[PDB]
From Swiss-Prot, chain B:
This is Flagellar motor switch protein FliG. The gene is fliG. It comes from Thermotoga maritima (strain ATCC 43589 / DSM 3109 / JCM 10099 / NBRC 100826 / MSB8). One of the proteins that forms a switch complex that is proposed to be located at the base of the basal body. This complex interacts with chemotaxis proteins (such as CheY) in addition to contacting components of the motor that determine the direction of flagellar rotation. It is found in: Cell inner membrane; Bacterial flagellum basal body. Belongs to the FliG family. Homodimer in the absence of FliF. Interacts (via N-terminus) with FliF (via C-terminus) forming a heterodimer. Interacts (via central domain or via central domain and C-terminus) with FliM (via central domain). Disulfide bonds: none annotated.
Length: 35, 95
């Protein structure tokens, strides 16, 4: 639950990134999936 | 501990949840999406450590393009407390 607390922190940053640009997430998905 | 890049992408999209993952995937072509849905479909259980590792690497990569202007104190605080805990950190930087 302290560990859970830092998970929500990471998820909040992820959420923030999504609302700014889903295409920046797609770019990292691409990078990862093709090696 | 060492995660294949295909599984990393699948863990990230699962963590986003279906409505946000679907929006991300519209930025990818049809053939990429089909391979990703197959990786997602066979992802199985995601451990809490896998999830945290993927999220940490994702955030570092997403900020790579960003110009940094100060904020170093808060950054150093998080590094010190993750590395050593706050009580030891206080003594490292000198009482």
């Amino acid at each position: 639950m302290p560990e859970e607390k830092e998970l929500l922190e990471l998820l909040e940053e992820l959420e923030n990134i999504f609302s700014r640009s889903p295409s920046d997430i797609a770019e990292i998905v691409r990078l990862w999936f093709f090696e | 501990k060492k995660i294949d890049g295909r599984r990393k992408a699948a863990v990230l999209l699962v963590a986003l949840g279906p409505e946000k993952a679907a929006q991300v995937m519209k930025h990818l072509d049809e053939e990429t999406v089909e391979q990703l849905v197959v990786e997602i479909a066979n992802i199985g259980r995601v451990t809490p450590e896998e999830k945290k590792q993927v999220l940490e690497e994702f955030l570092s990569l997403a900020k790579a393009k960003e110009m940094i202007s100060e904020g170093g104190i808060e950054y150093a605080k998080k590094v010190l407390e993750k590395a050593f805990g706050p009580e030891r950190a206080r003594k490292i930087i000198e009482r």
